Design a protein around this ligand. Structure first.
Ligand SMILES: Nc1ncnc2c1ncn2[C@@H]1O[C@H](COP(=O)(O)OP(=O)(O)OP(=O)(O)O)[C@@H](O)[C@H]1O
Ligand SMILES: Nc1ncnc2c1ncn2[C@@H]1O[C@H](COP(=O)(O)OP(=O)(O)OP(=O)(O)O)[C@@H](O)[C@H]1O
Ligand SMILES: CNC1=NC(=O)[C@H]([C@H](C)c2c[nH]c3ccccc23)O1
Ligand SMILES: CNC1=NC(=O)[C@H]([C@H](C)c2c[nH]c3ccccc23)O1
Ligand SMILES: [Mn+2]
Ligand SMILES: [Mn+2]
Ligand SMILES: [Mn+2]
Ligand SMILES: [Mn+2]
Lengths: 327, 327
């Protein structure tokens, strides 16, 4: 059977990259596939230190945001990763199949400075394995992610294959789902992806930002000194990112938005894109504001989702234990 | 040093391999005794730990049953202690993940066990973290182990303290219990500990060994060619190990066995120790043989024990989750 799985960390506020890279896919997917699971991955969150009150609130906030984006709990299973014990159990098993250098040499770790590598947690080092577990546990076939997680998907595939080699065919080898906006760039540093953890508030366009805030971020967005608007990602990273965003939020092609902007300079154009983003977000923000007020419902939503996931997970984990030799 | 009110003993053994003199003198004998000295005692067959070395599932399966027989035979009493299967309690890996988010890679890399085995998997690298979780999960205060695990125990204490520093005093900082026989030496290499994983059958005195086998192993035991029997670990490692075993099995002191052996050559002396070991093991071996006959009973003992552990564990893990911010 086919099944979609994807995850998002509760920490920070959901932004334009998350939305274009993945969340939009999630919403579409729920109507295309019979079985769909979306997880707020709180376990992944703590790979970096979290304040407990902040984390608790982020989970609630993310729940509101996802619902506001269109995730329907009648159609998908929206759940809290920590509430399903099986994730870590499978992760352990998987970790017994992975050599340390495989993890060390993943770009997301490898890129770090020697110091940063000395400072990061073992959880941070190992999250791809947990990620593999999150996916494999439900025998998922399709996984929507951003570009930064592609390498991890290969590991997930290798893990499925490796388990299968040993114990016989058990796990489907999952496939990534990527969008054109797989790597939305930071507004302030177009070399970098847009991130929830970016300390620079200007860089990141959040779902909950005011129109005034969004316009300002686009006003401050780094471009270049060419007046005309063109799409040229190698040449003009910031402008191209902005154009791409525009195309994505409008449903027009890059070629069309560039066409429509003739005679408009970048500076003006950037504010246009901001207006487009504001429109796309606006209904979502209205719903979030409504949802934020009923904590109980948000908690209930996760609880029920978590119960549904647990039923699925328990069954698989028992099968896994038998294959391994535990039972 | 241990000044928490509720005392609890925790210890674990890997199902894989054949229990040997070092396991028995180092740990297992202790366990039996402890079950009478402490009101709460947990002994875990740590199957999760075994798979840090790839296992054949049939072999692992059988190993678990066999370890259960061996422990019962040694005198572990399931109405006095909780004898359980690690894998049946999901909380261990849950806690382990959280702890792994509080430790850095170099700390793990520098551990002697890791360095020794890898001169290697993520699971192997991180077993000490799981070990900490195994202990901490039950708010255990006392941990009987051999010498080879002492370094790991210092990490367990550090992890408890780390968690406590962050979230408030929650975990007791456990203490090792060590015997005189904390490092029983290999009969063929007195510089090395006796190990289940040692390929050289002669080095290892197994619980299931025959009297002829045991006598031969002592006969072949490596030692010096000084005729008299003395205790001198620095200068006479092999002989001293044999003397120490003799004293442990008999209940007599090292100083006493040496005096009684006055007028005895080393060769005859070694065989005398062998006889003493055979006698100690003989009832245990008979019971093992009997217990192996009823697999349903062995399975049921673990099942019952695992259910008891699960209830204890669930309660703690929920508390931990609240502290962390998951709940
Ligand atoms: N700039 C981006 N463009 C497209 N997709 C993205 C972008 N940033 C994150 N994603 C995707 O969003 C999903 C959730 O990732 P995550 O929760 O780590 O968000 P994040 O913005 O990277 O936050 P953090 O900075 O805390 O890691 C993943 O599939 C990830 O690939
Ligand atoms: N030679 C020894 N002397 C005393 N205690 C030992 C000895 N070897 C192991 N132990 C103890 O026995 C317990 C179980 O360890 P374990 O199950 O790993 O046995 P092992 O013989 O080391 O097997 P392996 O070689 O597969 O690791 C631990 O507390 C360990 O410290
Ligand atoms: C720091 N952990 C992490 N970052 C990521 O981008 C992934 C995401 C959040 C993730 C965790 N489990 C998943 C399962 C399927 C798709 C994405 C994820 O994990
Ligand atoms: C390979 N894993 C491992 N080797 C050891 O000696 C320890 C033992 C078996 C262990 C696992 N969990 C424990 C909790 C308390 C005391 C010992 C252990 O772990
Ligand atoms: Mn991320
Ligand atoms: Mn419009
Ligand atoms: Mn060992
Ligand atoms: Mn006797």
């Amino acid at each position: 059977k086919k099944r979609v799985f994807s995850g998002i960390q509760p920490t920070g506020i959901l932004h334009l990259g998350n939305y274009l890279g993945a969340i939009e896919s999630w919403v579409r997917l729920q109507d295309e596939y019979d079985s769909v699971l979306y997880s707020i991955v709180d376990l992944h969150s703590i790979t970096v230190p979290q304040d407990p009150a902040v984390l608790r609130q982020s989970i609630l906030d993310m729940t509101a945001v996802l619902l506001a984006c269109g995730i329907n709990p009648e159609k998908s299973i929206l759940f809290q990763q920590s509430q399903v014990s099986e994730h870590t159990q499978l992760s352990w098993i998987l970790s017994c199949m992975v050599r340390l250098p495989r993890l060390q040499h993943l770009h997301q770790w490898k890129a770090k400075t020697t110091k940063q590598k000395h400072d990061g947690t073992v959880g941070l080092l190992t999250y791809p394995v947990l990620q593999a577990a999150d996916i494999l546990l439900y025998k998922s076939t399709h996984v929507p992610v951003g570009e930064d997680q592609v390498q991890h998907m290969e590991l997930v595939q290798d893990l499925a294959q490796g388990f299968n080699k040993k114990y016989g065919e058990f796990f489907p080898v999952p496939e990534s789902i990527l969008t054109s906006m797989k790597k939305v760039k930071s507004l302030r540093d177009p070399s970098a992806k847009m991130s929830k953890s970016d300390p620079d508030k200007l860089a990141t366009v959040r779902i909950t930002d005011s129109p005034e805030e969004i316009v300002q971020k686009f006003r401050k967005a780094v471009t270049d000194f060419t007046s005309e608007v063109t799409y040229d990602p190698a040449g003009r990273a910031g402008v191209s990112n902005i154009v791409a965003v525009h195309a994505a939020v409008t449903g027009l092609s890059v070629e069309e938005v560039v066409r429509r902007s003739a005679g408009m300079n970048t500076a003006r154009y950037k504010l246009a894109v901001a207006d487009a983003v504001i429109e796309k977000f606006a209904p979502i923000k209205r719903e979030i504001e409504k949802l934020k007020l009923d904590k109980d419902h948000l908690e209930k939503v996760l609880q029920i989702g978590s119960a549904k996931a647990k039923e699925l997970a328990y069954t698989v984990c028992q099968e896994v234990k038998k294959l391994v030799g535990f039972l």
